[PDB]
Amino acid sequence: QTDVIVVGNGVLGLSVGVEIARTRPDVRVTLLGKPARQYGATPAAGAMLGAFGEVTAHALASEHGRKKHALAVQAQRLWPEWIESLEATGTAADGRIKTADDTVVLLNTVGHSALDDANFAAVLTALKEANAPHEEIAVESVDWIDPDPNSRPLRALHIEGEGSVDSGILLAALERSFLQAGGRLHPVDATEIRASHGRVEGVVTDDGDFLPAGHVVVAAGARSQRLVAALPGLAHRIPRIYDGVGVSALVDTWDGSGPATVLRTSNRAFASGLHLVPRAGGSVYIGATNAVCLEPRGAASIEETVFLFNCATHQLHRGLNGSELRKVQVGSRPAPIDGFPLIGGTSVEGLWMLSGTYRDGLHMSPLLARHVVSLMDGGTGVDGLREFRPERDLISAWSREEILDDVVRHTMATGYEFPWRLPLEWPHMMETFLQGPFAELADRLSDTYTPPADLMTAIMFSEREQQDELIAYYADVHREWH
Amino acid sequence: DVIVVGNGVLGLSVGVEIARTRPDVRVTLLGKPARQYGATPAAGAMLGAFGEVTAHALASEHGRKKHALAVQAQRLWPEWIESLEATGTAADGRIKTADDTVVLLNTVGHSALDDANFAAVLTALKEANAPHEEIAVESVDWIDPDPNSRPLRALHIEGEGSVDSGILLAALERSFLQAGGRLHPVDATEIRASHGRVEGVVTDDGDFLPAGHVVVAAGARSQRLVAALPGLAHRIPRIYDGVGVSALVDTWDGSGPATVLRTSNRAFASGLHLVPRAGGSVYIGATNAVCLEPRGAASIEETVFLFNCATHQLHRGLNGSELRKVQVGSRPAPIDGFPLIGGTSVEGLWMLSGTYRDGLHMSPLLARHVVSLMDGGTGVDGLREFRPERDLISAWSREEILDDVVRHTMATGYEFPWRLPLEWPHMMETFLQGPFAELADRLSDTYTPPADLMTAIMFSEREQQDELIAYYADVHREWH
Amino acid sequence: QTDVIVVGNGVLGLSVGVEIARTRPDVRVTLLGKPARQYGATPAAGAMLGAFGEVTAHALASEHGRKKHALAVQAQRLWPEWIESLEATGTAADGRIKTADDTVVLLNTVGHSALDDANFAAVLTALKEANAPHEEIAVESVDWIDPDPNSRPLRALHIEGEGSVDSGILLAALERSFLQAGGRLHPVDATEIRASHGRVEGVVTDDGDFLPAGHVVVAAGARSQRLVAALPGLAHRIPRIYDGVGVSALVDTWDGSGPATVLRTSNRAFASGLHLVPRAGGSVYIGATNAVCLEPRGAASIEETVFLFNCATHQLHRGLNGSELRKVQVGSRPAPIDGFPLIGGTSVEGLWMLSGTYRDGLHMSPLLARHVVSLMDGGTGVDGLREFRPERDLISAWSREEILDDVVRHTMATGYEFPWRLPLEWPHMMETFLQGPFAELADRLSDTYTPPADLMTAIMFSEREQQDELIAYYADVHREWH
Amino acid sequence: QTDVIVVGNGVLGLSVGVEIARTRPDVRVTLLGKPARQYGATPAAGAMLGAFGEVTAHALASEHGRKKHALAVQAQRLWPEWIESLEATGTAADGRIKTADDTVVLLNTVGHSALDDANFAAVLTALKEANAPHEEIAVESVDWIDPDPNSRPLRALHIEGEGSVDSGILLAALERSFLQAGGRLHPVDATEIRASHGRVEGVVTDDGDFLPAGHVVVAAGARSQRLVAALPGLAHRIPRIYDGVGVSALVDTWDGSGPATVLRTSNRAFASGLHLVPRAGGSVYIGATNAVCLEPRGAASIEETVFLFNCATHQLHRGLNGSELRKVQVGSRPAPIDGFPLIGGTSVEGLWMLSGTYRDGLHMSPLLARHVVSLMDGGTGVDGLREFRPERDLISAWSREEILDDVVRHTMATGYEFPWRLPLEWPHMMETFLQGPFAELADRLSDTYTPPADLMTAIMFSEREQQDELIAYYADVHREWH
Ligand SMILES: Cc1cc2nc3c(=O)[nH]c(=O)nc-3n(C[C@H](O)[C@H](O)[C@H](O)COP(=O)(O)OP(=O)(O)OC[C@H]3O[C@@H](n4cnc5c(N)ncnc54)[C@H](O)[C@@H]3O)c2cc1C
Ligand SMILES: Cc1cc2nc3c(=O)[nH]c(=O)nc-3n(C[C@H](O)[C@H](O)[C@H](O)COP(=O)(O)OP(=O)(O)OC[C@H]3O[C@@H](n4cnc5c(N)ncnc54)[C@H](O)[C@@H]3O)c2cc1C
């Protein structure tokens, strides 16, 4: 037997683990990661099986964005049989993975017209282009919702067959399915990947042990690039992944009710958004904030909890105000510096990566897992994932001008989403005075690379030393690839 | 001899029609250039038929009849304007200021009014086979709202436009004089009648003017003038002052929209609209408060609310624009919610009043109706329920009005817009129901005032409530 | 038996347990209660040693209020030697009970003038009458605070020798001191007090056991009256105690700093308030909401968490916005139906109660513990606590008119404290329409008893069946005592 | 000729006209100006006799500011006898000039701490230094006011003998007193001052006439510099005066009541402020906005009317909300480009100026009139007016750094005064991004001159062509004086 080590116990690590263990009787597969799931994105997720719900005008204006969207639409088709195959290893008492079949997208005025109006139109267009079943519906026909009238939706979009899963029941089902197929769970973290003669030898663990392997799959979420970056040359050949720190909450509803569908807005300032995912047992999930952090953070800020709760109680259901808080959850969306995932092989024989999936790795997991396992078996996996190979020059999916327009719009959107109340001249004054500093920052960081808006705002408000370290990083990447 | 009492749109419109149709008779029109409490000069004005539609109005038979008359009036306006402009020159300016209207739906209001009323307007347009289109908000020209106050739906109504009310008044006066009418700039103090017939009018300079016909179109003063005649105090429904505040603004860049911009009718028959004017001016309107006594000056509250709504919901550029005039006028507000149009039990005594928000729009139809009746005709088919000598109409159940007055009260909050703890609205709804139910039960066993008047009565002095209880009891005695 | 059983493991149970064990070395004292401390007030407390800080105009306008205040002033004097005696049983690593020596009371406009202006004046007058060391200080001289300018204080009052304790370190010190003095901890709950021939026999526990005793001291917080009410006649002779559900939070500050003093407002709508209590290790405590509930609740509502966080970030320090949330805490202030504590003996020989202390049982604990132990030893304990004996007709400390004025003012204060933004006619309209329903409720409940504002609002918005049950309760109490 | 022509019929022109006519009975004094008083500051004034009420920390931090304040304190002493001398020419039935004897300054939180807190402390210090009678009073003792509780004052300062006049009754009394003393009113405007051989010959009027004179006193408000600048060399020797456009209103109060004192805040963003001046007959005056405009404007903007009304109804009396609006008034405060008035003689014999008095020309009028008449008679007038001579290099009363700090604080104050509601990170973000653009503008305008904050904000948001014209102006002034 030829040993495979999967580093990471989120949706991506476990999904690849399950696929390898089921497909490869010739391999012993060991999966690393602790039950604490420190900084874990997956346990903090609702989660929405978001393909069309995730559409933004800005994403679909780039070739790379359209390619990512096509993969999300393909992933949706795999979910019914994937769920069936995971539930089959359990019993009724393990609970149901699927919590909703459909999604309603709501349009209210608690946000920027330049994001919410543009994104609602882009979602409609993407659905029509895909010939996907959907209907614009009367807001009056949306069941369950009880918004503040001043925060109410005036348009609503029903998307058929775009639903949600319980992320906790999914994780439990993946672990159980992994064990059933002969996989071994080793509850320790990788400290170091060992390689020599251009080949992986295995992994040093944080209990001081060494585990030998012919294949190492890195699916360590936001830690994935930092782990691989220690190997020779790879610090400037694997795009950096940061922590997209997200806050969500589990609430026991006042009357034990919940909506029959996912309820969501389109993506909002700096890839945040508002949604409610149904759960069993009189619980609802509400999400979810997003802030790119240059270092990991495992606790919610006061600001994040207040913003999430204020949005949900005003825009979705005022009944949530009197509902009991059961849990505040925090996890790190793996946020790639060039805005696209890191999926496939490396220049190191037997070294694979599955990371940088940001807001929709959980949704894409069955497709991504099958792609990487096909590559490991000498196949070509899924068409169109070649552009997202982990060992690459940074992608430039947008012009600097497009990103500078976007970062100012997203900054203004943090105001409109609050929502603020300002003198009417103040917004245009702030727009005018935001342009110059962001243009200056972009010019200073690099002659060739521009970070997307989500990362550019984090860099703008970081320490001088952190900005200078990123200037050096971008210059070493340019040197490596040009 | 014919005497028209009142120099608003209704008095002058009937004056012009009489003078043009009866060249053998002397027609004299009373009223002063000051136009004290005058509704017409304070109007934009919108030729609002479909724009005026509410779910609540169209749920009553009387409301559907009023709406049918508004739709009929629209058809008369192009030829009416042509006939008034024909008596003038290019230099008098144009009566028509816009051909079309855009209705905007934003969330700066109550869902129970704005969502219901937008759906009712759409249905009314489709039922009437009126040309209209739901349009993308992005395609509405000129507007620059606060994003948190922006519309998410917009409705283009073709051939529903606006007039300059000042140029209309000047054109009516000029057309009246051209047709042989006489303007006598004094007020009527008293209508003289004996042996069941009008003799004429005593004026406030002490003179007596004889007449075979007296047409009362004195706006909110109309019923008080006729109520002095024997028996008529409890046979002519009372008319109150629907005090409205509007403003003329010189825009920062001299621009204006090509269409009327408006919301549907809001709390207590207020609303937000912009009517285009010539010369880099726009009209913004308009507040509404039923007052048991007349008021000729704007409150601070009314000016701030009108300006706040226009700058946030229509165009932030209006914030830096110059205020040219704050206008105040009294919408004639009938106690039973419907106009007073036609003849009386007194031979030669006619009334044209109680038109509230849309007398100006209905004026050519109403003028032609009353002139047809004066000539022995039957005028316009659907006006019979709105005869001025009547028992008070009960167009809605007490329950419907109690639901409406609580919704309108809550709408004053959502329209501000307020920011409150989330439990407060349901708490206020619960504690508003009892007092309004108690007031309604106390006022009368049979009559219920509509929401606009019920809120004014709720917050009036005990003595004013008791006087209204006596009024309602004397009306019941008279008609039952 | 000369055995003593203390029922409850909060500050009051443990404080009386320690005093009994130290003063009666020949007797076995057993203390009941579980480490979970379900609904526990003490673990959720900051806690402030609040005497002058707790002063309201409304409390000091009643004879009973002035008597309660005199006891709080007396309790303050006991704290230095009490803390010394508790720390003496531990070592350096157990940490310090005292976290601050002084308090600053802040006056801002994020509240009702009828509460905050009246209460600030009452605190000043109480300090001057007691000849207590204090100073009105310039707001600019208050260290650490960084309020939103629109939420800033314009007056500030320094109170010397009014400080705070770490409630967690206090509980650990009381348990350790109890063991050191020969006390036994039995981690089970009392289900039933056994009595016959007018005398306590002991306690049935929830593991089915029977523990014999000559003395039973009930300090079970908000459960105290429900436990004793099962004994013959006592349902209408021991005033009911409800749950004053309070939400607080532990925050790790952005820079590890904290204030050197307690920072607080005066008591606000329905005995809520805003305060920050210093803690060791770069943590601060923020508190604290209050809602009287007719049934217990062990979880924070969304509303409570948002209100607490919004007040602290605007009125105390905007830096708390970016600070990490470590814990949301929930506990039940024991809320007596007649507004005064239940301290002393009963008509049942050997049955004692220490409860109904609402906002300041922790502060009064050393005085209350010494009072009850003196009574148990045949003394008269502390002068002025005989009015607060647990077996009594309901106190009527205020006229019905005073309470109706108070409940409308407190209702309006929930608006001003938010703070709301309303059309200027709405407040007077709401005041006018609130008076009638509260007058009607008060008249319907009883001809003789009026619940204080905090309880009256809970009864106003309770189910018809709960109102009717309270009407019957008040009628059975009147029958028993008249 | 020994004939005197006064150009201007505001408080300054009429005050100097009265003093000349009374002191020189042997000479013909003619006063020009029309009853419309186009752009007139005086008729739009309340007016407050503001000396201590006008104190700001920023003004008193400069030597020129302390000199201006000393003149305001000296002017206050003249008012009782000045009023007596004007009322003596009339009867009871002419009405009373004085409408209040005293002023209450209110401190609320509807503003920037960096202006309102600093200015309240500066007012207190200035009063103590001048030995002026005053008292800090309980807010509860301020009669009449009925603020929104969230907008209420927490501190109040009673200033004795700092009152108000009815500006309309003052103008009528000055005209009557002028005629009584032999003055002639000629209701036309001056178009041109004629001078040759370094001496005034007289004035061309806008009806084409020529009026000869040995003395011409220019008190034409904001038109005063434009009139004199036409004479040879004077275009860069007389500092420019702009229009400080101010909006005020007359309101008939709901019940005919008014306060017994002036009610005011200290000066606020860009020399705006909130005040109520009592009037006879159930009327109150409310003021007053301020905006420096590079061209005159005779109509109120929507923004100005809403801001004035919102502040008065929330911060002074909610009863004003239901009160009737009688008149919106607009006048131009003469706003000198270097921040100080233009008072005294010129290089042209017999040519005098009284202008650039901004917020307190009306208050200073009796002192300024006496100063100019003393100079015309060969005296030295009032001590300390020498720096404010009209023919001068632009004053630099503050460092560029002081003005840049001030303009950012005033910009932020437009937010806090609204008052806005924003996410807590936004204010520091806006402060950071406002500094650079104002620093850049200041550096670009001139190497030596810096406009005060009120003018700098108007220049920042003016057209490029208007900025360039001001750069040229500053360079021509530097050339003339260096
Ligand atoms: C703010 C506002 C906005 C409006 N907007 C619109 C709009 O968009 N569309 C629309 O269709 N309509 C609008 N209206 C007007 C509405 O249609 C009215 O119902 C209509 O204008 C009433 O006309 P009237 O001639 O009956 O009354 P008025 O216009 O009030 O004319 C009555 C006249 O009679 C005079 N008078 C009083 N007593 C006497 C007496 N004793 N003798 C002689 N004369 C006397 C008065 O001084 C007055 O000039 C608006 C009104 C207001 C106040
Ligand atoms: C948010 C908040 C903030 C506060 N802040 C302050 C402050 O700043 N200053 C101050 O002085 N005080 C403060 N307090 C506390 C206040 O003084 C309380 O009145 C006091 O803590 C009550 O103590 P207790 O021991 O009576 O009750 P608790 O602390 O409730 O203890 C009772 C214990 O008995 C247990 N129990 C219940 N039933 C049984 C049973 N059948 N058998 C055995 N055990 C049982 C419970 O689980 C619980 O642990 C605060 C409280 C809250 C909720």
Author numbering:
A (entry chain A), C (entry chain B), D (entry chain C): 10 to 491
B (entry chain D): 12 to 491
Reproduce text from the manuscript describing this model:
To probe the importance of C281, we mutated it to alanine or serine and E426 to Q426 (a residue related to NOS-formation). Biochemical assays confirmed that the both residues and the NOS bridge are essential for the reaction to proceed, as neither one led to the end product (Fig. 2a (iii, iv), d (iv, viii)). Residue R342 turned out to be critical because the sidechain of R368 was misplaced by intruding into the glycine binding site as manifested in the crystal structure of R342A. Next, we performed coupled assays to detect the end product to see if it could be formed by complementary pairs C281S/R342A or ThiO/R342A (Fig. 2d (vi, vii)). No product was found, suggesting that (1) glycine imine (the product of ThiO) is not the intermediate for R342A (with intact C281); (2) the first-reaction-phase product formed by C281S is water-labile and unable to transfer undamagedly from C281S to R342A. In terms of conformations, the mutants showed no difference from the wild type except for the sidechain of R368 in the R342A mutant.
Here, we report a noncanonical FAD-dependent enzyme Orf1 that adds a glycine-derived N-formimidoyl group to glycinothricin to form the antibiotic BD-12. X-ray crystallography was used to investigate this complex enzymatic process, which showed Orf1 has two substrate-binding sites that sit 13.5 Å apart unlike canonical FAD-dependent oxidoreductases.
